[PDB]
Write a protein that binds this ligand. Structure first.
Ligand SMILES: Nc1ncnc2c1ncn2[C@@H]1O[C@H](COP(=O)(O)OP(=O)(O)OP(=O)(O)O)[C@@H](O)[C@H]1O
Ligand SMILES: Nc1ncnc2c1ncn2[C@@H]1O[C@H](COP(=O)(O)OP(=O)(O)OP(=O)(O)O)[C@@H](O)[C@H]1O
Ligand SMILES: Nc1ncnc2c1ncn2[C@@H]1O[C@H](COP(=O)(O)OP(=O)(O)OP(=O)(O)O)[C@@H](O)[C@H]1O
Ligand code: MOO
Ligand code: MOO
Ligand code: MOO
Ligand SMILES: [Mg+2]
Ligand SMILES: [Mg+2]
Ligand SMILES: [Mg+2]
Lengths: 244, 268, 268, 244, 268, 244
């Protein structure tokens, strides 16, 4: 297998719907991240959220193709990153652009303890066709980076406890059962909504380093801290990469 | 299906929801550049060969833009293969190799653009959005580099660290995104054969074939990158491609005129 | 007043000196793009409404550029209001909110530009300096994002953290800087009323009014950003603006033809 | 009031006319700044000076509008910043561009003790109309940044002791009386020249954090050091922001 | 000399090998923009003088582009001399001064471009590659800044820290690189004299001279930067330059028409 | 003479033909560089190698001028830099672009121990005419930077022991005699191939600070470490700059 570029790196993806809740959710998350800075070397990546749904509504009404909608949704993830980095600026944290993440993450994490970036990958008008909704979104971009770096782990911070058998906020909440652990292949052959991109399960099948990814509830203080120490507080997704 | 029902699904459901995906599939379809043709000039097959191959194709491009709007992408070639071999021997991942390959395609686009500059055709970093030169009859063409922008976010192949989405895929995805009417791959063979014509003496020429028929006969990875055939089956706007021999005088001109030179590969 | 006396003052005095300021005011006045018209397409009032509003205006733009040179700026809209609400709830200052709003106006300019690309009209980052497309009869128009470049250097309002200089001010300052002949704001109401027509049933239409008359009647902050009315009173080149309803078919075309649709607001 | 982004930051504006005096003034200032690096976290911003007056003379003769002259004068402030940063390069100081100052100042001040930038704000062709001379100049840009960051202070370094009742180098030097302290509102209702932009007094009226700004003579070694410790060695300008 | 033998030398020898250098010298010679003319507008000699000098030259440029393709570079002038004096007094090296000088040439290009914008002529950062405006009869000209890109990598002179390669050298190297047909320097004197005409009263006008004859008479460093005369002797495409007085009405127009105004300096 | 901008800096140029040998040569060099990071402040610059020879073959066949070939060859040097920086990323090393090297090297070397860049100078289409091969290549660009910074030294890492009287791999290997020490003026008046650019000898004649440059064999582990301590393990080139 290829070498690990940054084996000491920890990657954390913050869901856009978490940022959408405003200060009631962002302020406790910021204080938890502040206490984590002396413990880990962190790359924090933000998702898009509800604003990408509105630009999808306008863009689809205008008939624009999927390669047009992909950078429009990525813009909302970058704005969430600027907001989060501004709240952590007094701790030495700043937002960094994609080419900086791709080529100069090592020097930027030597200068400070953590940086913030956009979780969307730069596919832009080269997005894959098939669906009118861009497939390679925030979860997929965060995992591609973490596995390419050979990072120590990737944690996904959502607004629910984890993955259920059905949408716990949808029409069939009554039959929604929590899944403490699952494999990417088991999820991929299932039909129904998920809290993660379906393209995430595809890039997990070709991964080289990351063996597991945990999805935790960011609205419960302490669960992100516990997940970064390997404690089981959410849904564990096994990628299929085998350990030594 | 209505706009009000799509908007409600877009606000209340996950983007992974099948009901949302089905409603979005019924949206209108706008073609951004429906009158343009995307052409890929091969790196190893054409540009690496020098004056004998490039100069006649420059003449065809200048003559063709009088009646056809063109987006001209460039391949990489042997210098990218050298970079891939060095980086793969060091254990570097596919995302790192993807950035190395883009620089070679940029080199080839710069060399082609300097031969076309006196004719008014520019090198661009945003071909499908370069609206002014594509709209002027005095220009009517642009040159761009064919590598996709994935960089470190490149999806790796099932085995190995060679980037699976290179200049063939980058040029095709442009044609699909902007709703172009035609996609032509310019290589150094007459078309698709039953076997590799360089290493086999009894290969039979195939004028027309579908992607499914190619797979059932072991031809998935031959004249074109095997990932671009799967992209073709999922495309919305470009449902077939044509592969022609750029070393034959006038082959690109005749393909743009609707002549069935080379091999036509259909999605279905 | 002479050039030699102005130069001496410029070298020996502070720029705050009233004698220097008075001598600089007597300098010649050059208009950079005197034949162009600046148009602002509303974000919340037009682009947020989708196909029913944008498609007819695209048709008017394509038809109008045959006889009128156009600089087309875009507003932000409801996505910027959502970003403002999140950031204001966190206690972030106006300079931070200004950068968030620019991204939404960039989104809307990209969507409009992709609908106009096949007609040759590009999206630019430097509209008043995009000399080539504005000079070609085949193009004669450009699209730009309407937010000012102030970013963290944005001057805050007297109260609150909402940036006071947004897309209305950004588009007007372009028209003033380049000495354009006309500035048209495209919204979703017929013009200025004595009260908000959406929340009041007896508002009376106002065809023409000055900035001073607007203030003496409580209309300072209504159809237009209140800071842009103060910029209008200080302007050198653009001494009046026009506000028209973009949802009425042909309203932009008739305004460009000199018809007195909507409301005319004069500096004095 | 909004939160303070970088509450530990100290901002220093160096007047362009100070840089115009050459090595006789720059060399003592560089040595004073060198000794201040271990004591403060500094953002150093440079003004334009006499070269902006020449480009104004040419631009006004050509009839160019005020939005054309604003970036032309800002260029001379950036060149002064490159000169000052080169003299401090051996101490780890470099010039940083405006987008870096706006979005990544936190990480750059985590890597080194001080950075240099241009004091002019990026108004460019969007400069306000009214006067043929750009109103938002070096003093105004430095204060807008310092107040937006919520910095600990802003000090203006000039070639005179402070603000007088008249130009101490002009036609009426005999009646020029030094003002040890003043308010922004008192200065704004006065007529006559000042050593600071008149637009500075306007942005002081809407400020949220900065309560006072001192103008000191940079040609006297030790006064910048004293001003950064709160000692009264020049003219104190009260902004109108009230303390807690 | 053959292609196969050149390729073998290119792979097996150092680039310093005389046998490799001789084989590369026999390669074909392609001119990128053979129909264009490069013109340098002096900074101190023209632009620093203001309206009386710049406005008539703008009129000549607009009239000349109807029949002549132009690449217009700008000089720096007195503001760069002020920056050089400050930085040299501090002991800064030539590489640092080179970056300071480029900003002044950028200022002058921006001022000239805003006077030409309404005529369709743009300011570019890549003039020899700005293929579209140079190909349109409606434009046929571009404006660029004349300083070379060397920055900290600037080669210093034998003595002093003043950069030896400034706007004269930057404009000439453009003309040489793109194979232009003509290079014209626009200054404030009729041409080359036997002595400095500003500080000597008996200087004699020289209509035509070679570089070798200039050196044998102490004229190496006069109307042109002395390093540009050495570049002229090594050039492949531009073997002579012309220096004309831009303060004389119509001098640039007559030089473009083939009239022998000013001084012609030949490489041999 | 001008002041020294970064007097504590050490510059190392890695030949492109060394990188061309692949992991067999790169892996031992990477481990030697890893051990040198705590000892020096390093700017590592990479050359082009054999890939530039191929783009020369294509470009000359198309008839392109020398100003066209210069940026094409510089691209291959930048790719070698990205490869080398990726191998050192886990140590905090990243590739930095030319404008960053020119204006912000001080802050980047305050954040980390070493950075990698392209050794080619940014002459591009402004390359000097005369020869159809670009004269200002990797050796010349590295020395121009090192002398402009006033760096403590410059070491050139090649695939041979040093400079010989003839090409030790060419047609006349039998008469090739090793030169332990030489002057730039002596080399400049000689005819025949060299392992360094002939333009390097020209910029050495106008140098202001660098007094000597050593060329060492990077295929022998330990010689780069010894050269950075001033030990004579290769060919010493005296520039002509006289010591105090
Ligand atoms: N099987 C499932 N298990 C858990 N949640 C589900 C499932 N199916 C749908 N959901 C819904 O998905 C929601 C999370 O939405 P989503 O993942 O789109 O937001 P996000 O990840 O924060 O945004 P972004 O992807 O832009 O960062 C949950 O609130 C939940 O209601
Ligand atoms: N009331 C005043 N009090 C003090 N100085 C004054 C006053 N009015 C005018 N001046 C003059 O202003 C001069 C300072 O000039 P100015 O503020 O333009 O330069 P600067 O601030 O260094 O330049 P920049 O604003 O480009 O950084 C002083 O030397 C002084 O002569
Ligand atoms: N007089 C000489 N002494 C030593 N080597 C020589 C001499 N003349 C030629 N050479 C050859 O030059 C080769 C080095 O080639 P070169 O300097 O072009 O590569 P490089 O410096 O690694 O590449 P780059 O300049 O792109 O970084 C040596 O292997 C040697 O064979
Ligand atoms: O984006 Mo940066 O590269 O903090 O030095
Ligand atoms: O400008 Mo930088 O972003 O020193 O890392
Ligand atoms: O390129 Mo950077 O400027 O590491 O902060
Ligand atoms: Mg999710
Ligand atoms: Mg002042
Ligand atoms: Mg060598």
């Amino acid at each position: 297998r290829p070498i690990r570029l940054l084996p000491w790196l920890q990657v954390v993806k913050i869901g856009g719907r978490v940022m959408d809740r405003g200060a009631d959710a962002i302020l406790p998350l910021v204080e938890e991240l502040r206490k984590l800075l002396p413990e880990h070397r962190l790359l924090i990546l933000t998702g898009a959220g509800v604003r990408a749904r509105h630009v999808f509504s306008v863009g689809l009404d205008l008939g624009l193709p999927v390669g047009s909608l992909a950078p429009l949704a990525a813009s909302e993830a970058g704005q969430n990153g600027h907001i989060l980095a501004a709240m952590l600026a007094s701790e030495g944290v700043s937002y960094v652009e994609h080419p900086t993440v791709a080529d100069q993450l090592a020097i930027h994490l030597s200068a400070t303890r953590a940086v913030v970036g956009s979780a969307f990958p730069p596919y832009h008008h080269h997005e894959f066709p098939g669906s009118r909704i861009p497939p390679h979104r925030a979860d997929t971009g965060a995992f591609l980076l973490a596995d390419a770096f050979g990072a120590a782990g990737l944690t996904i911070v959502e607004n629910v406890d984890g993955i259920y058998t059905a949408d716990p906020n949808g029409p069939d909440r009554g039959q929604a059962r929590f899944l403490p652990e699952t494999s990417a292949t088991d999820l991929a052959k299932s039909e129904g909504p998920l809290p993660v991109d379906r393209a995430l399960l595809d890039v997990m099948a070709t991964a080289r380093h990351i063996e597991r990814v945990q999805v935790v509830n960011g609205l419960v203080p302490g669960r992100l801290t516990a997940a970064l120490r390997g404690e089981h507080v959410g849904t564990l997704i096994r990628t299929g990469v085998r350990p030594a | 299906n209505s706009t009000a029902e799509l908007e409600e699904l877009l606000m209340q459901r996950s983007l992974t929801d099948p009901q949302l995906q089905a409603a979005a599939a019924a949206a209108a379809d706008f073609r951004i550049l429906p009158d343009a043709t995307v052409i890929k000039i091969g790196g190893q097959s054409v540009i690496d060969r020098g004056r004998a191959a490039v100069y006649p194709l420059v003449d065809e491009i200048v003559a063709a833009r009088k009646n056809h709007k063109l987006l001209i992408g460039t391949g990489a070639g042997t210098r990218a293969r050298h970079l891939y071999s060095i980086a793969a021997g060091l254990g570097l991942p596919a995302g790192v190799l993807a950035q190395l390959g883009s620089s070679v395609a940029d080199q080839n686009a710069a060399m082609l653009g300097q031969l076309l500059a006196k004719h008014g055709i520019p090198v661009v970093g945003g071909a499908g959005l370069s609206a002014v030169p594509l709209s002027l009859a005095e220009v009517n063409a642009v040159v761009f580099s064919g590598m996709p922008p994935y960089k470190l976010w490149m999806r790796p192949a099932a085995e190995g660290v060679i980037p699976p989405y290179r200049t063939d895929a980058g040029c095709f995805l442009l044609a699909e995104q902007f709703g172009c009417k035609q996609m032509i791959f310019v290589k150094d063979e007459d078309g698709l054969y039953t076997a590799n014509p360089k290493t086999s003496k009894d290969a039979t020429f195939i004028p027309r074939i579908s992607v499914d028929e190619m797979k059932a006969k072991g031809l998935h990875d031959s004249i074109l990158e095997f990932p671009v055939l799967d992209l073709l089956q999922s495309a919305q706007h470009v449902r077939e491609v044509q592969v022609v021999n750029g070393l034959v005088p006038g082959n690109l001109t005749r393909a743009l005129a609707g002549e069935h030179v080379g091999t036509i590969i259909t999605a279905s």
